[PDB]
Amino acid sequence: GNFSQACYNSAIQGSVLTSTCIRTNGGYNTSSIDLNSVIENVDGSLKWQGSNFIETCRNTQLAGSSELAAECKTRAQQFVSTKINLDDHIAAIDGTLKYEL
Ligand SMILES: OC[C@H]1O[C@H](O[C@H]2[C@@H](O)[C@H](O)[C@@H](CO)O[C@@H]2O)[C@@H](O)[C@@H](O)[C@@H]1O
């Protein structure tokens, strides 16, 4: 992971992370990744190893350089605040954001 060390000007809109990442040729590239493919809302908490959090969460934000923050519904249908460190699994490879397992 650790995209945040390779990238800057990052933003979250909905479930999409955008960022500008360094390229090996000396330049940079702007890219994006849909975090909804790789993050699950598990009883109100954002977790890896699943998908589709955006269906039952609201008010997504980037906190600091790498934290996804949101408000997500529990199984009992009430909202809690939750966060996950995108640096756990989101990497930058030659200027492009990629998920790494
Ligand atoms: O319904 C879509 C939802 O399914 C799964 O989440 C379950 C649970 O973890 C949630 O707390 C409640 C919230 O209503 O929904 C399900 O019971 C996950 O795959 C989740 O990412 C997805 O949004």
UniProtKB/Swiss-Prot annotation:
Q: What is the effect of changing S51P?
A: Protein is exclusively dimeric and has moderate anti-HIV activity
Reported impact of N29 to A/Q/V:
Prevents N-glycosylation upon overexpression in yeast without changing anti-HIV activity
Question: Which Pfam families does the annotation name?
Answer: CVNH
Q: How is the protein altered post-translationally, as described in the entry?
A: Cleavage, or reduction and alkylation of the disulfide bonds results in the loss of anti-HIV activity.
Q: Which SMART domains match?
A: CVNH
| Record-level Gene Ontology MF annotations | carbohydrate binding
Biotechnology section: Overexpression of this protein to provide quantities adequate for medical use as a topical microbiocide has been attempted in a number of systems including E.coli, Lactobacillus jensenii, the yeast Pichia pastoris and Nicotiana tabacum; see PubMed:20162270 for a review.
Establish whether keyword Ribonucleoprotein is in the entry. Answer: no
Q: Which SUPFAM superfamilies match?
A: Cyanovirin-N
Q: Write down the InterPro entries for this protein, in alphabetical order.
A: Cyanovirin-N, Cyanovirin-N_sf
Keyword list (alphabetical) reads: Antiviral protein, Disulfide bond, Lectin
Q: Which GO terms describe its biological process?
A: regulation of defense response to virus
Would I find Disulfide bond among this entry's keywords?
Answer: yes
Similarity field: Belongs to the cyanovirin-N family.
Complex formation: In solution exists as a metastable domain-swapped homodimer which very slowly converts into a more stable monomeric form at room temperature. Under physiological conditions it is unlikely that the dimeric species exists and indeed the monomer is more active against HIV. Interacts with HIV-1 gp120.
A further note on this protein reads:
Its activity in situ is unknown, however it acts as a viral entry inhibitor, inhibiting HIV-1, HIV-2 and simian immunodeficiency virus (and some other viruses such as feline immunodeficiency virus, measles virus and human herpesvirus) infection and replication. It prevents essential interactions between the envelope glycoprotein and target cell receptors by binding to carbohydrates on viral protein gp120 and possibly by other mechanisms as well. Addition to cells must occur before or shortly after virus addition. Is remarkably stabile; the protein can withstand multiple freeze-thaw cycles, dissolution in organic solvents, treatment with salt, detergent, H(2)O(2) and boiling without significant loss of anti-HIV activity.
Function summary: Mannose-binding lectin.
Query: What protein name is recorded for this chain?
Result: Cyanovirin-N
Q: Where does this protein come from, organism-wise?
A: Nostoc ellipsosporum
